[PDB]
């Protein structure tokens, strides 16, 4: 009842050394004296186990084995022996005693293993009922990123889950801190009701709860899906040259499917506009695309996902549009106006150079969901007017932080205090608009006194909010008011009817241009579930790193066919649909200026004989997959958007993107070998070149018998029969003549 431990403490206190230790050691010093060890350290346990298992008794167990396991086997083995001491509570045990217990010990009716290790049985249930597709062989472009190896609880973070575990298992030891969430409280009451009358040790209960509730992450090289059920089978699903198609056993997660529907929508939308019919291609790809081995159009008829590119895929089919987008989890529904996106290089509050994406153009908003409402008048970097509503008085105060992050003026971008790294510890680019969100939730005093005040007229139906938390009726902040009733429901939460056209601009029965394809967010996220665009319009796995390698891999094996199309009737070659998903990597204003340069380079390779570089026709060819312009400008590199970072591709020589390797006789793209082009080096390696400059011929290396040096942009005022020395790029000079 608790009498035995106080009698034992009396017995120990009657010893003098024990009493001095128990009276002089504090609870903090007990952590030090608990790990006190005065013997020699045991090293090398592998070697020690190798030779200790040759002995008869390598195992030390408690003395109760003398009552549970006999001293003699049926075969005559000795199972345990008493130690060299006399009153030791410890015996030396043979592994034959372990085998005796496993074959002839007491059978128990109560086993605890499927409950304590329920996580691993969940894993085995996911594997056993899983399905295997084929194996495809291609160059896997893995990217090292942080993923979840244990998903944890959705309502908890790791520290909140550890505090829930302490409140459940050891409730009288939690100390000063309380549980600061209602989710913590519901999980705590549920786990306390679940774990009543448990004869398991509390530490094993705590570790079982940590396997259930605590989210663990690791940096792993992932090629495909990144949800926690595709990460446990990462050794099975991917390798260096192969992909095993695997669907785990069981029902998928909802928030995982909601995310990967958006990523698959944006790929099909961005692929479609560089087709000659952007609607007929989007319908051809939506009906064949599958997510976690489930078709797309059956997901697009039951999902409440409110996103811009999802709405193109539904308005093409016929599913009704719930027109809104989501920042922070709230429905940010537009009303009126129109904008367009184009990024820029702006400065932030912590003196860091940031590449933000700001929506330039007027947009009227009705932002409302589940706790409040807001009618945000807003244009270009200007929170003009927001009559914000609510239900409780405090829930308006947190949503006040929500709208003022989305505003992005020249006030909130320079009213940031603290340390807000938009990169991570691996120099990985975090998206900026959600980093100001999680920062201003608790640091809000810089967003209330830098925002200032604006004068208003005493009209009824309007309240106010001050910087210092005062509800007011004379003054308030700039562009933010407070209403009472707000805007009612069943107009944001109605899925309205719309119609689509050939170029995917989505307009309703009145004619509101609700979605244009130019308003699609051109980001490449990594999906939680795999996506099989089983179509002849895409490649095997999408991704900007994969579109680069697979396009050049296809030109290299089809080079015997494509070189003949290049030699005669070349405009049939440029119009290939294999070349079309490569154009999603080029920015929009750069497409016609690159094909006009490239085809002008390609025509000078034809009118000048002997200047046939098959390694440079390959490199420039998927930049001609567009109707050209007549803009006679000079380029030394072509930029390519991959994960936000514009990779350059040099017209002359290797790069980090297109590297030809003379040693292996191969073209290396992004570190992936994409095959030997033709192996025609002896016909190649010429002197005169024609596909580097526009209207100019490189004539060998540098020579100063013609005058000074120029650069690539300063060749505009030249004449006939005039040669020069030009910095061509990558630290070298060539003799260059503007021809006839």
């Amino acid at each position: 009842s608790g009498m035995e431990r106080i009698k034992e403490l009396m017995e120990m206190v009657k010893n003098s050394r024990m009493r001095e230790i128990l009276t002089t050691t504090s609870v903090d010093h007990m952590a030090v004296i608990k790990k006190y060890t005065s013997g020699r350290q045991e090293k090398n346990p592998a070697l020690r186990m190798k030779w200790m298992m040759a002995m008869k008794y390598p195992i030390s167990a408690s003395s109760r084995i003398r009552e549970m396991i006999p001293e003699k086997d049926e075969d005559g083995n000795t199972l345990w022996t008493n130690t060299k001491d006399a009153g030791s509570n410890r015996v030396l045990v043979s592994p034959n005693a372990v085998t005796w217990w496993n074959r002839a010990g007491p059978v128990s009716d109560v086993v605890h293993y499927p409950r304590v290790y329920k996580m691993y049985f969940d894993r085995l249930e996911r594997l056993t009922h899983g399905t295997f597709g084929p194996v495809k062989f291609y160059n896997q472009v893995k990217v090292r990123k942080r993923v979840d190896i244990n998903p944890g609880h959705k309502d908890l973070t790791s520290r909140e889950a550890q505090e829930v575990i302490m409140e459940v298992v050891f409730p009288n030891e939690v100390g000063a801190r309380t549980l600061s969430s209602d989710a913590q409280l519901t999980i705590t009451k549920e786990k306390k009701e679940e774990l009543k009358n448990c004869k398991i040790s509390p530490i094993m209960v705590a570790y079982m709860l940590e396997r259930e509730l605590v989210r663990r992450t690791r940096f792993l090289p992932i090629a495909g899906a990144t949800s926690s059920t595709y990460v446990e089978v990462l050794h099975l699903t991917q390798g260096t040259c192969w992909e095993q198609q695997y669907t785990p056993g069981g029902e998928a997660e909802n928030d995982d499917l909601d995310q990967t529907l958006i990523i698959a929508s944006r790929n099909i939308v961005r692929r479609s506009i560089v087709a000659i019919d952007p609607l007929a291609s989007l319908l051809s790809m939506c009906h064949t695309t599958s997510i976690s081995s489930e078709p797309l159009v059956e997901i697009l008829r039951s999902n409440p996902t409110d996103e811009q590119a999802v709405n193109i895929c539904k308005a093409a089919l016929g599913i009704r549009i719930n027109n809104s987008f989501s920042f922070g989890g709230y429905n940010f529904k537009r009303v009126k106006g129109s904008s367009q996106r184009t990024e820029k290089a702006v400065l932030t509050g912590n003196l860091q150079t940031l590449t933000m994406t700001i929506f330039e153009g007027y947009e009227e908003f009705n932002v409302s969901g589940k706790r409040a409402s807001a009618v945000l008048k807003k244009g270009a970097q200007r929170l003009i007017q927001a009559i914000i509503g609510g239900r409780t008085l405090e829930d308006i105060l947190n949503l006040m932080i929500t709208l003022m992050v989305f505003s992005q003026e020249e006030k909130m971008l320079k009213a940031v205090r603290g340390d807000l790294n938009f990169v991570n510890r691996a120099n990985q680019r975090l998206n900026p608009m959600y980093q100001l969100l999680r920062h201003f939730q608790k640091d809000s005093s810089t967003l209330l006194k830098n925002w200032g005040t604006e004068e208003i007229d005493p009209i009824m139906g309007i309240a106010g909010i001050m910087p210092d938390g005062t509800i007011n009726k004379t003054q308030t902040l700039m562009g933010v008011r407070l209403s009472q009733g707000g805007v009612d429901e069943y107009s944001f939460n109605e899925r309205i009817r719309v119609n689509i056209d050939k170029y995917l601009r989505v307009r309703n029965e009145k004619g509101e241009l609700l979605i244009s394809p130019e308003e699609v967010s051109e980001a490449q996220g990594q999906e939680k579930l795999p996506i099989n665009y089983n179509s002849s319009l895409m490649w095997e796995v999408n991704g900007p790193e994969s579109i680069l390698t697979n396009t050049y891999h296809w030109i290299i094996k089809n080079w015997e066919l494509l070189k003949t199309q290049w030699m005669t009737d070349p405009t049939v070659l440029y119009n290939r649909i294999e070349f079309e998903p490569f154009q999603t990597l080029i920015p929009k204003g750069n497409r016609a200026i690159y094909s006009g340069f490239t085809r002008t380079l390609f025509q000078q390779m034809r009118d000048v004989e002997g200047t046939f570089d098959s390694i440079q026709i390959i490199k420039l060819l998927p930049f001609s997959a567009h109707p050209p312009s007549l803009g006679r400008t000079q380029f030394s590199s072509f930029t390519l958007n991959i994960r936000g970072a514009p990779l350059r591709l040099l017209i002359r020589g290797n790069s980090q993107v297109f590297n030809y390797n003379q040693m292996e006789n191969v073209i290396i793209v992004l570190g992936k070998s994409v095959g030997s082009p033709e192996r025609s080096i002896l016909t190649e390696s010429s002197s005169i070149e024609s596909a580097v400059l526009r209207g100019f011929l490189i004539l060998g290396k540098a020579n100063s018998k013609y005058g000074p040096v120029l650069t690539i942009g300063e060749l505009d005022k030249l004449g006939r029969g005039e040669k020069a020395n030009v910095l061509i790029g990558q630290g070298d000079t060539v003799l260059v003549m503007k021809r006839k």
Binding site: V27, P171, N172, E173, V174, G175, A176, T178
Partner: protein
Amino acid sequence: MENFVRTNFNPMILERAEKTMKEYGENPQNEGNKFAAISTHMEVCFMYSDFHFIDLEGNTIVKENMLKHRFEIIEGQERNIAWTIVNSICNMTENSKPRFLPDLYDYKTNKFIEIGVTRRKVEDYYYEKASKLKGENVYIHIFSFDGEEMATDDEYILDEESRARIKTRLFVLRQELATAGLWDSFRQSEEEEFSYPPTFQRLANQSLPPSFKDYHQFKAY
């Protein structure tokens, strides 16, 4: 003062006062009037609970010497010990857990008790204490050297004799602070440091670039 407190309070009161000051990181001789105020708080918290029992029938009695105490004393213990007591009580009587550590717990009325002792007026420190403790169902009780005491919502769970004895002891202590003169400093008294000792100061002076003779001269440079 110092010897006043050591001649006026019991050895257990001064022992818990010295242990409290050490736990909060301050010697009793550096802060003497704070030591006297801590011994005052401890003595009032002990006179609130001494010889006050609950019998087997649940009726509170007062004794001189098979009984259990009415109050659990939380002031004086170490902070994690006091939080163990408070957490065990809040888990038995399923109430809300107080945000700050209280001073007593009453098993009869099932309530946490907070004790303030002031030299100033009772009502100003009472309103500042009820503002500091806004949000909890504690029972505040302010005593003064003046001879007035304030309860919470004018309700009393202690009897008349014990509260009169507390006010008698506080009046005697206040008059004892006057006759030795130390009521002027008493009634008008309401960071991390890391220095170098001299041997390490000379080691610091010998650890510089060769054109500096002093560690502080180099720190200024």
